[PDB]
Amino acid sequence: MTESFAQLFEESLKEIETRPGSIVRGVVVAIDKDVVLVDAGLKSESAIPAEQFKNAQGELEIQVGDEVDVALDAVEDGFGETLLSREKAKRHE
Amino acid sequence: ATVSMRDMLKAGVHFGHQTRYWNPKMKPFIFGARNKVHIINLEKTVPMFNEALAELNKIASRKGKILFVGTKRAASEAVKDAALSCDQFFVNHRWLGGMLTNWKTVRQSIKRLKDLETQSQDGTFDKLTKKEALMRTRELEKLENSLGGIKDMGGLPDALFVIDADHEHIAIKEANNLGIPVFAIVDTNSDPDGVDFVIPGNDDAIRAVTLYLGAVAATVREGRSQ
Amino acid sequence: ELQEKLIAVNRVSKTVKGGRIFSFTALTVVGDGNGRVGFGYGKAREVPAAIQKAMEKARRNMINVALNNGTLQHPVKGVHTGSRVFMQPASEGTGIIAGGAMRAVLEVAGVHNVLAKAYGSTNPINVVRATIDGLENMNSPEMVAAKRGKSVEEIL
RNA sequence: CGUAAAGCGCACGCAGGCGGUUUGUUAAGUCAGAUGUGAAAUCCCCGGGCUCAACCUGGGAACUGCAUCUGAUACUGGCAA
RNA sequence: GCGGCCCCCUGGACGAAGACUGACGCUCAGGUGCGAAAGCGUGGGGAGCAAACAGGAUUAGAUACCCUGGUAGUCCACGCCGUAAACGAUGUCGACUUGGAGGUUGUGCCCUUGAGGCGUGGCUUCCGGAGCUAACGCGUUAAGUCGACCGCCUGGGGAGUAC
RNA sequence: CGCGGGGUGGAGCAGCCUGGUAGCUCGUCGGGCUCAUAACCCGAAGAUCGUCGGUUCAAAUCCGGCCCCCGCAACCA
Ligand SMILES: [Mg+2]
Ligand SMILES: [Mg+2]
Ligand SMILES: [Mg+2]
Ligand SMILES: [Mg+2]
Ligand SMILES: [Mg+2]
Ligand SMILES: [Mg+2]
Ligand SMILES: [Mg+2]
Ligand SMILES: [Mg+2]
Ligand SMILES: [Mg+2]
Ligand SMILES: [Mg+2]
Ligand SMILES: [Mg+2]
Ligand SMILES: [Mg+2]
Ligand SMILES: [Mg+2]
Ligand SMILES: [Mg+2]
Ligand SMILES: [Mg+2]
Ligand SMILES: [Mg+2]
Ligand SMILES: [Mg+2]
Ligand SMILES: [Mg+2]
Ligand SMILES: [Mg+2]
Ligand SMILES: [Mg+2]
Ligand SMILES: [Mg+2]
Ligand SMILES: [Mg+2]
Ligand SMILES: [Mg+2]
Ligand SMILES: [Mg+2]
Ligand SMILES: [Mg+2]
Numbered sequence: 001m002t003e004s005f006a007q008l009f010e011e012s013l014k015e016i017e018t019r020p021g022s023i024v025r026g027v028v029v030a031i032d033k034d035v036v037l038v039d040a041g042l043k044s045e046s047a048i049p050a051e052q053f054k055n056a057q058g059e060l061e062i063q064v065g066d067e068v069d070v071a072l073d074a075v076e077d078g079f080g081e082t083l084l085s086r087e088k089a090k091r092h093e
Numbered sequence: 094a095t096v097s098m099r100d101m102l103k104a105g106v107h108f109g110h111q112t113r114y115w116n117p118k119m120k121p122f123i124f125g126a127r128n129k130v131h132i133i134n135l136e137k138t139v140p141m142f143n144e145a146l147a148e149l150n151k152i153a154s155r156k157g158k159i160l161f162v163g164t165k166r167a168a169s170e171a172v173k174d175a176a177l178s179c180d181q182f183f184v185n186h187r188w189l190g191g192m193l194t195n196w197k198t199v200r201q202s203i204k205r206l207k208d209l210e211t212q213s214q215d216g217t218f219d220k221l222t223k224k225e226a227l228m229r230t231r232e233l234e235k236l237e238n239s240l241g242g243i244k245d246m247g248g249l250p251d252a253l254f255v256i257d258a259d260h261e262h263i264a265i266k267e268a269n270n271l272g273i274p275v276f277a278i279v280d281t282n283s284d285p286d287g288v289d290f291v292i293p294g295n296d297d298a299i300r301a302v303t304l305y306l307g308a309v310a311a312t313v314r315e316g317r318s319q
Numbered sequence: 320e321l322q323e324k325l326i327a328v329n330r331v332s333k334t335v336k337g338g339r340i341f342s343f344t345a346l347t348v349v350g351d352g353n354g355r356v357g358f359g360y361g362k363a364r365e366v367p368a369a370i371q372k373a374m375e376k377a378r379r380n381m382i383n384v385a386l387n388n389g390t391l392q393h394p395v396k397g398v399h400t401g402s403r404v405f406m407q408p409a410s411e412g413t414g415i416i417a418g419g420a421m422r423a424v425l426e427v428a429g430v431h432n433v434l435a436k437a438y439g440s441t442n443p444i445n446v447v448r449a450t451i452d453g454l455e456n457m458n459s460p461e462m463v464a465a466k467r468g469k470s471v472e473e474i475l
Numbered sequence: 476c477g478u479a480a481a482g483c484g485c486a487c488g489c490a491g492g493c494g495g496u497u498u499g500u501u502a503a504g505u506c507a508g509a510u511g512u513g514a515a516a517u518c519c520c521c522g523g524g525c526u527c528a529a530c531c532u533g534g535g536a537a538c539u540g541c542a543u544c545u546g547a548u549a550c551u552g553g554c555a556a
Numbered sequence: 557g558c559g560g561c562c563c564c565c566u567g568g569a570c571g572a573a574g575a576c577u578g579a580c581g582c583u584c585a586g587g588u589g590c591g592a593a594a595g596c597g598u599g600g601g602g603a604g605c606a607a608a609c610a611g612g613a614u615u616a617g618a619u620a621c622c623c624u625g626g627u628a629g630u631c632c633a634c635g636c637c638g639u640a641a642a643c644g645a646u647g648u649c650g651a652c653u654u655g656g657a658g659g660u661u662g663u664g665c666c667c668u669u670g671a672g673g674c675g676u677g678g679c680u681u682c683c684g685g686a687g688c689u690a691a692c693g694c695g696u697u698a699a700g701u702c703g704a705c706c707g708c709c710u711g712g713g714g715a716g717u718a719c
Numbered sequence: 720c721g722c723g724g725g726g727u728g729g730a731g732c733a734g735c736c737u738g739g740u741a742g743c744u745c746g747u748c749g750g751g752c753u754c755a756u757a758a759c760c761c762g763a764a765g766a767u768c769g770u771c772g773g774u775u776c777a778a779a780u781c782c783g784g785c786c787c788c789c790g791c792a793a794c795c796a
Contacts, residue, residue, distance in 0.1 A: 005124070005135045008102055018128045029299075037299075043108035043130075044167065044297040075130060076111045080280070080297035117654045117685080156760080180751095245750090247762055323739070328776085343776090347739090366776045367739085374739055401690060440690090 016041045022072045023089045028064050038068055038084055042075050046084035094311045096142065096304060098135050104304040106294040109133050109281030119281045122293035131281040133293050145276050145290040146312045152252050153316025160243070162264050163256030164188060168302045172256060173242065175306035179313040182250065183242035193249060193267040203244055206236040252276065254309060257296040259283035278305055323349040323374055324423045327443045328366060345373035346443055349381065350427030356454070357381025358424070358447050382451070385459040389431030392460070397453020401440035404449045409434045420446040428454065
């Protein structure tokens with residue numbers, strides 16, 4: 001069954017949006033003291049600083065496995081790191 | 094074992110780096126470009142991935158020693174855990190330039206690690222003013238982090254499986270100098286000239302590396318179990 | 320069984336703050352006399368350490384040469400930096416006719432009969448590099464027939 | 476022939492050198508064969524004679540050239556399109 | 557080499573689309589022309605600047621650097637000169653050989669949604685691969701792979717001097 | 720004292736001749752393997768080449784002695 005990579009890839013591009021500035025729902029893969037790994041469906045899971053998850057009271061409001069809204073800033077910062085800025089996504093809110 | 098194109102696309106293998114940072118050698122494996130991003134061709138990946146698995150299966154069936162290499166913060170934990178699942182060897186922190194070509198020096202460091210750990214464990218002494226003992230334990234800890242994955246390697250490995258060939262170019266160069274075959278996940282920005290078995294795919298995503306590593310560890314255990 | 324020859328030893332200097340620091344270099348070539356020949360450089364403070372370091376380096380870094388009954392397959396030209404080397408096969412009993420640096424490498428490799436000439440700089444280090452490079456870049460009737468997709472006699 | 480000696484300060488341009496592609500013809504270059512000649516000695520090969528060798532000597536090859544004749548038409552030249 | 561603005565006369569280059577000629581081409585000894593600055597000749601002009609020169613200083617000395625003046629010259633017209641580190645220290649012409657970031661000047665297409673995106677020509681700056689190089693470096697504007705033609709080199713000094 | 724040959728990790732053999740590099744086999748300790756022992760694998764340990772010297776930039780090799788070993792040696796009532 002030669003389901004073309006061309007066919008399969010057109011479908012994938014229709015699912016996710018790759019424009020810089022789109023808010024993408026991402027899964028919390030791990031929560032470190034300073035960074036939270038958030039997958040989105042791009043080249044790499046983004047290490048988002050925990051400082052962005054701290055409320056005005058300083059608490060980390062997130063657990064592992066939650067979907068988090070992250071603003072897609074850049075897919076490739078020259079190092080294969082997908083820069084995700086959830087703090088900018090709160091502007092829409 | 095066997096991985097599917099659907100699974101690899103799900104894993105995100107097809108993504109590559111920006112177009113400007115590419116290596117023109119990679120051109121055969123590049124499907125095209127979208128949004129200034131190179132898209133690796135998975136039709137080239139799958140037969141190459143299976144073709145590499147066959148040779149790894151063969152080596153494992155000949156009691157071959159496999160060295161898993163990847164020191165990216167992304168893949169450091171995955172390579173260690175995946176390598177341990179199949180009773181093989183790994184390097185998950187900075188590759189020491191000359192681990193293979195200067196093995197005679199690394200072996201002496203292994204001897205020091207073994208002797209040092211014997212004292213702090215078998216010798217149990219630590220009755221050394223409590224400051225010389227403590228600093229000696231620090232040295233034990235330092236060597237353990239550096240050489241834990243190969244401390245019992247004994248000799249030169251029979252093959253290297255490396256994540257991010259461009260990042261770990263040094264290890265690939267030592268192997269070529271010593272004739273050791275290299276299996277490498279090669280991103281669009283990497284150089285495939287030094288790799289005997291090229292597996293073209295994304296090398297920065299934990300999902301993709303886990304896909305690669307799970308399959309390799311599964312094939313190695315099958316080759317050993319035979 | 321490996322045969323080794325010292326080609327040249329040289330004294331170098333470093334001119335440290337206190338004065339000149341003298342160290343020695345070696346040039347050695349090892350070979351099996353049957354188509355395998357390597358060369359090592361070797362550098363040390365004393366001549367014996369230098370020659371020993373060179374021989375060990377020369378035992379590895381050894382390459383294989385498609386000899387033909389102690390003679391070259393065909394004329395070859397080898398150039399490293401400023402040394403250009405020409406070697407052509409000769410009939411049995413001619414001897415090895417070549418300059419000193421080329422003499423050693425051809426003897427040790429097993430070329431019994433060769434006519435050779437060195438053009439350009441005759442610096443021993445580069446002459447040896449150039450002759451080894453030329454010998455490696457010399458193909459044989461079987462490998463050329465395999466490459467060209469034919470048989471030997473079809474090539475003759 | 477960037478820095479070691481060595482690219483005219485730059486341009487136009489006569490003589491000269493070189494010439495995309497296709498067909499026909501020619502046969503100048505080129506190629507093949509034959510013929511004449513290329514003195515003898517000398518050099519080279521196989522021999523012979525001085526007791527050996529130097530030396531002498533028989534036959535051959537060579538003298539890489541030139542001219543004429545007869546053929547070939549790939550390439551180069553001429554002519555025609 | 558060319559730098560305010562305007563007019564007049566005039567040379568080249570590039571692009572798009574189409575038509576036309578039908579090898580009409582490349583290089584070029586000698587030859588001819590152009591050729592910074594200084595300089596020369598005739599005649600003008602002369603604000604500033606400034607070799608020479610005058611003076612004041614500095615200095616062991618100061619025929620210099622520094623200061624105050626200042627002639628030729630620098631400017632115009634017409635002739636001559638014909639040389640520069642006249643340099644990319646790289647002759648002209650053609651073909652071929654991975655990439656990236658730009659600048660400048662055309663042109664085609666897509667949603668111009670709003671200076672966007674995607675192609676395709678010319679010239680140009682930087683980085684760098686193979687390759688080359690003695691090394692430094694050059695690297696599609698080559699010093700890479702080649703082809704045609706031309707100029708020049710042959711140890712340093714004597715000497716780009718003598719005749 | 721005769722002549723010849725040999726001596727090399729604890730044992731058995733290459734290495735010697737041509738001067739530059741110590742290898743092969745058993746044993747021993749440990750680990751993997753095996754349910755276990757054993758066999759097997761990964762390692763690791765163990766000679767200064769009998770010793771004394773000489774030569775040489777440099778010796779297991781080349782030179783000599785001593786020390787043994789092995790073999791031969793015409794002569795026991
Ligand atoms: Mg010379
Ligand atoms: Mg100079
Ligand atoms: Mg010069
Ligand atoms: Mg010029
Ligand atoms: Mg011209
Ligand atoms: Mg023609
Ligand atoms: Mg003509
Ligand atoms: Mg003719
Ligand atoms: Mg004659
Ligand atoms: Mg006779
Ligand atoms: Mg005769
Ligand atoms: Mg013709
Ligand atoms: Mg013709
Ligand atoms: Mg001229
Ligand atoms: Mg003037
Ligand atoms: Mg005047
Ligand atoms: Mg006047
Ligand atoms: Mg003044
Ligand atoms: Mg000049
Ligand atoms: Mg100029
Ligand atoms: Mg310049
Ligand atoms: Mg010049
Ligand atoms: Mg460059
Ligand atoms: Mg003159
Ligand atoms: Mg002059």
